[PDB]
Design a binder for this molecule. Sequence first.
Ligand SMILES: CCCCCCCCCCCCCCCC(=O)O
Ligand SMILES: CCCCCCCCCCCCCCCC(=O)O
Ligand SMILES: CCCCCCCCCCCCCCCC(=O)O
Lengths: 238, 60, 60, 268, 268, 268, 57, 57, 57, 256, 125
Amino acid sequence: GLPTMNTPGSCQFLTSDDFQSPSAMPQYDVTPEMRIPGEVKNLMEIAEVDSVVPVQNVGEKVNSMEAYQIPVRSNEGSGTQVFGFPLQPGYSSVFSRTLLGEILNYYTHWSGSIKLTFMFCGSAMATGKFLLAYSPPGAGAPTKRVDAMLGTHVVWDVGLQSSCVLCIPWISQTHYRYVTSDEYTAGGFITCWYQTNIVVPADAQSSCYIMCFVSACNDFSVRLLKDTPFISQQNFFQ
Amino acid sequence: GLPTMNTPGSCQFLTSDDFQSPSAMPQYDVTPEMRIPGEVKNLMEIAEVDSVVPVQNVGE
Amino acid sequence: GLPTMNTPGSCQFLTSDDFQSPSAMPQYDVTPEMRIPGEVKNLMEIAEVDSVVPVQNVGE
Amino acid sequence: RVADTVGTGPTNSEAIPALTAAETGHTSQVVPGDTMQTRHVKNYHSRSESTIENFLCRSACVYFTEYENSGAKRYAEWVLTPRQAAQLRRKLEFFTYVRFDLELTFVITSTQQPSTTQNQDAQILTHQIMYVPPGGPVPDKVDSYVWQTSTNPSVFWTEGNAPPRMSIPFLSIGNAYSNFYDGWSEFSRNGVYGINTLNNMGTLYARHVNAGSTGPIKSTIRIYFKPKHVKAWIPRPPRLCQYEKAKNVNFQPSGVTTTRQSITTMTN
Amino acid sequence: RVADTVGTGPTNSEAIPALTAAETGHTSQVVPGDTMQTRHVKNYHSRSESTIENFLCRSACVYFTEYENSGAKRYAEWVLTPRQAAQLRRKLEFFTYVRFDLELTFVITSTQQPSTTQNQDAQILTHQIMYVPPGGPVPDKVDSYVWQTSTNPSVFWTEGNAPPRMSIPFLSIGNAYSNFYDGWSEFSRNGVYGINTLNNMGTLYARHVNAGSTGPIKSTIRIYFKPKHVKAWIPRPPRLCQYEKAKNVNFQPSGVTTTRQSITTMTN
Amino acid sequence: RVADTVGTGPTNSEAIPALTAAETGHTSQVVPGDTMQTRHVKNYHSRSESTIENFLCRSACVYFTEYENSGAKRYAEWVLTPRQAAQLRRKLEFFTYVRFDLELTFVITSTQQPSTTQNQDAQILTHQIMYVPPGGPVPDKVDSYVWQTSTNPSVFWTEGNAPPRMSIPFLSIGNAYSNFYDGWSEFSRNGVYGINTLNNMGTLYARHVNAGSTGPIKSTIRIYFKPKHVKAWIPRPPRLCQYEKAKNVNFQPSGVTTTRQSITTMTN
Amino acid sequence: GAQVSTQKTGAHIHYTNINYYKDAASNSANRQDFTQDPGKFTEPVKDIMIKSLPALN
Amino acid sequence: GAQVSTQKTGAHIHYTNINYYKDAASNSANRQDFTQDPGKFTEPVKDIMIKSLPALN
Amino acid sequence: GAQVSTQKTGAHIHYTNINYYKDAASNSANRQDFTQDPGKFTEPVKDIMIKSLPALN
Amino acid sequence: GYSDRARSITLGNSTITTQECANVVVGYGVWPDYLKDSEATAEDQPTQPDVATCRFYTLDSVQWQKTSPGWWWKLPDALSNLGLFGQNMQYHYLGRTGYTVHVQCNASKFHQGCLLVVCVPEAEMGCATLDNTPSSAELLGGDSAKEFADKPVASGSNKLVQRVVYNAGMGVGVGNLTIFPHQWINLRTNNSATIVMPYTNSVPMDNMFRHNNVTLMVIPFVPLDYCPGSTTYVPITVTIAPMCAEYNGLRLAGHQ
Amino acid sequence: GYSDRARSITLGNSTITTQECANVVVGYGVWPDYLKDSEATAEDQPTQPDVATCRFYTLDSVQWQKTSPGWWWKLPDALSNLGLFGQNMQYHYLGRTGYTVHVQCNASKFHQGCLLVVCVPEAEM
Ligand SMILES: CCCCCCCCCCCCCCCC(=O)O
Ligand SMILES: CCCCCCCCCCCCCCCC(=O)O
Ligand SMILES: CCCCCCCCCCCCCCCC(=O)O
């Protein structure tokens, strides 16, 4: 009899533990493996793929395909705003239901840069110029193009290639941020403005739509696995 | 006293387990083996032998 | 089953003990370290610093 | 380890990293040093918590059920199926096909029932759990012969110590467990439709070996799954809608997301 | 590992692999590539679950019996014999002779009996199990001297912890355990006929060491066998009929199998 | 090992080790052999108990709370925060920033409540403790679905054995845990002021898995912290005053020290 | 005197074992003994029968 | 036949493991397998697309 | 991969330790780290001050 | 020199030409091939029809209107009645094939719109009545396309599919359908969309009547629009080519 | 391959993209650089704000009508109230800088017109 001593933490069931257990089916021949396309080895191979963003989630628009459309028409003025939302990739309604948002909810902390791709879906005769902008926190959100021009911006010229990219970089005081709402780790604001105008000829539609796709860059990371506050049940399903 | 920690699954009786147990009859001389025809080492040596099939299993 | 024997002092909680325990968050990436001035490695680095003495602690 | 940012400077060129074409079904591989000036940063973050093994290897309650030491409900039965609990079901359905070992843990707990019987002095309760693969006999009653477990795996557990736990190997006639099946059981294209077609996993039964007391006692058993050595293929989008049944993918139509006030509002 | 199919092509020859003669008591060793065209398949299946050690090495309940802490039935006795439970008996009778070690496991569980006695506050019960080889003295009562176990093997078990378990070596005066015996005990060809002739295995007794309480308590002991290091010879056909007694091969005549509607019907 | 005194003799020189200038913010490094004659002493004392790891690595109770098996208070919740107990709080606040692993130990103990219910015969109680990181769902009731712990860490403990204990890694979005924060949450310099701004640690819930008895039972859980692998920076003066709340540094003005009778009195 | 052997794993890792008792009847079951020889039963004839040959000639 | 591997520690120590059961399905989970290949999903096109080049030319 | 170190004994013997978990956050506390450097606090001045010298000259 | 817009695809006796196309999407990085010997299960020798089955089959056209929720096609069922591909899949028990889907829609420079083309593997669909599962006449319509709805389908006691579009019938978010192999047809840039999907399944072969491996979904995220005077009828055409199709288990003709 | 029409210009945290542009005009053949030591006069050490001042500032838009004579901007004054460029030029006595002017006007294929863009040094009016 080898003299032993039991320490605090014996006969306890920690759900995130890693031990060895006796097998119920001993010497069981497991079916051989076959080659299946699309093997996943990390959750960041999924978050790194684009997905359409519902920017127009206003009113009944969530119950149609109009949530994904950003309306842009010919304006008798200049420098007005197209859209805006905060850099909250997992808490804001604009981002909480996309592939990136969905994966982010299962975790507590996130880090890295963000990609926002915009596709212009007018006619081949429509021309335009837009000013995508990201403003780090510290002031409010910009309310004119003279306040948004001062941040990290791109001037998108519309023609041929109908797709521009705005990369939101990592500008934080900490290494990580929170997926939940926390002022200590506020992200900033993303806005879009008219640079010049949408110009069209006769017999062509002066109202077009833009679409947005969100994804993550190579530096993106997540931590602290937790439960998602989306799924729920009252009784066991049958 | 070597400090240890018990894990879930102690003092349980899994009928398909494989351990070592103290012998009730220690230092017992077992009868020697003899050669008997027809030693079986697998159940598929039995299933690989023909047997008559009752195809006309109708009524009495 | 390796035959063992438990000694006095099992399943007890001594607050000044030194063991190993299963981690609740497995494979968790810890924030990297940065250089902060004034790292302390002993309490006698603090007691070796002057401080003013209240000798006239009389009345109010 | 995640990639490290490269420091860049001012450019004036005919290169166009920002301008792309999303109609090609290709995600742009643009880094932040393509649309602005950056500094060299030495990144040390790891992607060690996003692995499928780390994301899925955690115990989850998939079911619990009750039985008694007297009366009518003397034993409990449950066709094995994880699609009763929402959490683990929604985690697995991220992929089309999976392949894993299993780690089973059982939390059995008894309670004394209200009654008017007197002089109750209970002895320790022992429980038996038995697995019947599809095809074997079933326990029509509590004291039937099937509980002899000559070949069927089973676990005897006395109340008061560590919860019983076992390891199950990847049991499937196919090469992977199908989370979704778009088809029928019959070649006549009628009958059972969906993944219930491939649910041939066996049945789990549970009982008290002794009655313990002269008064009533109800024992509840909670079952916990824990996938190990996970492989997964063909990622799918998340459910979004709320589940309704355990055998099909039926749902009630729900909006894309929750709303805000305008297209310019920075508040939920 | 099972054999791998060899790919074949079209043939026109005087070879006749299909045509054989079954009157020679020989099974035809024809592979599918003899009556059709095949492809080369790399088989990876294993015959690792059909082994006799894997088929037989699983614990099975062979008996259970009761005794009390007061009254008349104060101890329990059982001549060791596996032919009381149907499942393990039918598994072993697949062969004529076997030879194995044994692993014994006991599940002892107590229950409080209904009574009108008051102020019952029971102390932990300890049980004793004792094996008497053929020839030794027997416990005529509960507090007899035979329970001193000077030479007889015995196990003391306190209720509340891991079930008692021991290892028994191949105990036989012969070279193998005979599952069937076609003969008598006496040279006069009368008397005991059959395998009861070779059943000289000893007796197992069980009791409470202390009474525990002032109220009644009934303890049931379940015995589990588990063959190890198995050897077997001369396979026999399966029983088919239902068993009747534990000492003989008596049966009630039963039909070859269950029926169907016609010789062309594809339904049970 | 502490320094060893050097033996010195009589001196008459223009050296002035005693005379210094304290306005330079520098502590004089004078040894006793500078103002007197000494002998050579071989010192063997060690500074092995003044280390921060030895000073801080001891378990301390930081909180305890109650719940019941029936009635209203069926589960317990506690936002994790060590600033409720005075002892460990005052030990940590010696430094401005710290960085350590954690060792959690839980002492769960039940008590029977006074009541008039009869025929009480309780079964062993099992407890569940669950950690919810900030952002996840919360258990609005006792039998809610959140207790399935698909991803949330949790511990199941049956009363009667070793206390549950786990290890927590340094969880912080920053590079160190800030014991003090001189600022606000909002950029508008209003709102929450102080260290409550950086307290985003999650929540701990506790419940009974079974009710056990038909009578009332109250279970108290005591939580114990134990820092490991400690790093600390920028030592601060000790609190002196008595603490008032857990979220701020508010205090009531107190005298520098306790008094004596005169400037020449050698008595407290 | 530890014995290192191979584990039962799928197709298309090792384990260690030590004997603690001096009775060989206490060791674990002999699970991995995949040896089969069906020739005692399937073909017990005195003369060899070539498959692609007339059984009666 | 002990296996010594490296522990999961921070940036900017080893552990020992032994297998006790002959079924490979009883071993601990494969936690440290940090291998990613997002190219099957992010860029599944037939022709290569240079980043600093017009996607349509 | 056992680590043998020295025990804390008086002045005027070894112990063995093995790591069982793959998380470095589960190891025992780092009790024996007797390293002190009071120079950051006791003497933080820009110019060196010789003890047997007038502080102000 | 050559351009990236022009691209010709030859299969069997069929050639597809396009002068304004985006890059081809090849499945999950895998090109459809044949089943190997170290991965097969059925022992007999399979038959490969090659040119007779691996060619471009064109289906009926659908009209893109200003209010079209979208369409879908169960790929294996769609061709179960075309040429020798249908006959081989009708006389055999197991089959295996990949696909090459080409979707075409042409309009002028004064039209606008955007269509999502996605090959969804194992698109199990849901019923409008939670009580039952949908009919085979509701799920798969051969020789035609199946239309989505803009409003939720009513419940009751039937076996109708929940053809709401923003839920994709699968009870998900439609904007996430870009996790599967996909391609966008933008009227101002794109003209057609090609996808080369390999054989995806959890078994080496499968019966081709009671199981549909993939599904082609065409949804117009951005509606079609034009100004009075331009063409109003805008159709959408779908051409599917089987690739590396093999069959095993010859039997009598039928599906019961 | 690439075309001569497409061109991106990155400065600071600003990127300008164009898909239909003529070749860039670089001054009098000279690229803006810093003042050298063999050409300086003021003895003290200068401050270079770099990213905070060398970035793209957009001004208000003007409407091109069928009867517009034209517009002009005094370059140094135009930005004297924008970001940190204006602040640095407000707290200092001497300054030195070159410029990168991008003028944008988009219209359809059914519009016509021609605009002259000229950087006039020392345009005394
Ligand atoms: C004594 C108890 C033994 C219990 C043995 C249980 C064996 C069956 C395990 C069922 C696993 C089902 C996995 C389903 C995975 C999926 O399709 O998503
Ligand atoms: C303290 C308890 C010890 C019990 C010792 C039991 C020893 C006898 C074992 C009997 C084995 C009988 C095997 C019969 C096999 C057969 O003939 O089929
Ligand atoms: C199943 C229970 C798991 C419990 C997990 C608890 C994880 C959170 C630990 C909180 C530590 C807080 C340390 C604060 C240090 C400080 O700022 O002074």
